[PDB]
UniProtKB/Swiss-Prot annotation:
Domain Bromo intervals: 17-123
Name of the protein this chain belongs to: Bromodomain-containing protein 4
Lineage top rank: taxon: Eukaryota
Miscellaneous remark of the record: JQ1, a thieno-triazolo-1,4-diazepine derivative, and I-BET, a benzodiazepine derivative, have been tested on tumors with success. Treatment with GSK1210151A (I-BET151, a I-BET derivative) has strong effets on mixed lineage leukemia and promotes myeloid differentiation and leukemia stem-cell depletion.
Sites of the Glycyl lysine isopeptide (Lys-Gly) (interchain with G-Cter in SUMO2) crosslink: K58
Protein species of origin: Homo sapiens
Family: Belongs to the BET family.
């Protein structure tokens, strides 16, 4: 069970822009989650080889992680806030799909998601 290529972070064919909401998603949302004590499993794609999770990419067909999101934000990959919000939600949902309630990794995702929800509640109106 080899690892797939990671999600793209650059694509000249994809439209993109800078928006004040995307700036907030980087400076506030990503930065807050990235520094958290429980961020580290989510800072790069799941390595199913090293973790001995050969079923991971049989079950999780839309992988996502904060390393990817960080690069997307820094590299101005997104057209709007919704695209980036969707990536975060994909990441959390994947973790809950693959794992079981009360697992350590699920508690870690839950902690991060609580903070995500607190920050997204104050997403600024588009300028
Ligand atoms: C680098 C990464 S990425 C990751 C994990 C780790 C370690 C952990 C994990 C991280 C921290 C703690 Cl305290 C416990 C588990 N769990 C796996 C699934 C699993 O069951 O893996 C073990 C078989 C436990 C290796 C998982 N699912 N989704 C993700 C994002 N992760």
């Amino acid at each position: 069970s080899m690892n797939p290529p990671p999600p793209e972070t650059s694509n000249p064919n994809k439209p993109k822009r800078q928006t004040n909401q995307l700036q907030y998603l980087l400076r506030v949302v990503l930065k807050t989650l990235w520094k958290h004590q429980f961020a580290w499993p989510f800072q790069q794609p799941v390595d199913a080889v090293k973790l001995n999770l050969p079923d991971y990419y049989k079950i999780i067909k839309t992988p996502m992680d904060m390393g990817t999101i960080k690069k997307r934000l820094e590299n101005n990959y997104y057209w709007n806030a919704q695209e980036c919000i969707q990536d975060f939600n994909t990441m959390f949902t994947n973790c809950y799909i693959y794992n079981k309630p009360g697992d350590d990794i699920v508690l870690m995702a839950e902690a991060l998601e609580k903070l995500f929800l607190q920050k997204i509640n104050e997403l600024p109106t588009e300028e």
